[PDB]
Each structure stands twice: as C-alpha cells, then as structure tokens.
Amino acid sequence: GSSGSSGNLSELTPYILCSICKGYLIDATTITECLHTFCKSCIVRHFYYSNRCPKCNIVVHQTQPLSGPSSG
Ligand SMILES: [Zn+2]
Ligand SMILES: [Zn+2]
C-alpha cells in the first residue's frame, strides 16, 4: 500500500515546529511562563514525568504545585 499524500509549502515563523514532535502541532498549547508552543499531549506528557519545560527547563508551577500519585 502507498497511502502517500503531501505537498504544502509556505513562508512563516519556523517556530511553529515542536521541540518534541519536531514537526507540526495539533492543539498548539502555549505556556504562560516562557511563552513556548507545545502540543497539549506533549506539554501534558512532559509535565507527568518532569514538572519543567522541555525547552527552557523551567519548573512551571501553574497546573498544580503537587505531583500527585499514580492514579490514572
Ligand atoms: Zn509536540
Ligand atoms: Zn520553556
């Protein structure tokens, strides 16, 4: 199977890219601290293991000052 489709080129801020996904974004959740762009799942996932920013490495104490147990 091919299932191959693509062909899009534009000129805009190269920041759109994700420091994690290293590609396109989905939710486009911007931080209110360092003002960085990170996919909801990305920033949310990174906050699960590390309460810091995978960009500047800052302990963003916005979501919650508590780590919390392993309750799904
Ligand atoms: Zn991402
Ligand atoms: Zn940051």
UniProtKB/Swiss-Prot annotation:
Phosphorylated during mitosis. Ubiquitous. A zinc finger (RING-type) spans 18-57. Signal peptide: none annotated. It is found in: Nucleus. Transcriptional repressor. May modulate the levels of histone H3K4Me3 by activating KDM5D histone demethylase. Component of a Polycomb group (PcG) multiprotein PRC1-like complex, a complex class required to maintain the transcriptionally repressive state of many genes, including Hox genes, throughout development. PcG PRC1 complex acts via chromatin remodeling and modification of histones; it mediates monoubiquitination of histone H2A 'Lys-119', rendering chromatin heritably changed in its expressibility. Within the PRC1-like complex, regulates RNF2 ubiquitin ligase activity. Component of a PRC1-like complex. Interacts with BMI1/PCGF4, RING1 and RNF2. Interacts with KDM5D. Interacts with CBX4, CBX6, CBX7 and CBX8. This is Polycomb group RING finger protein 6. It comes from Homo sapiens. The chain holds residues 124 to 182 of 350 of the full protein.
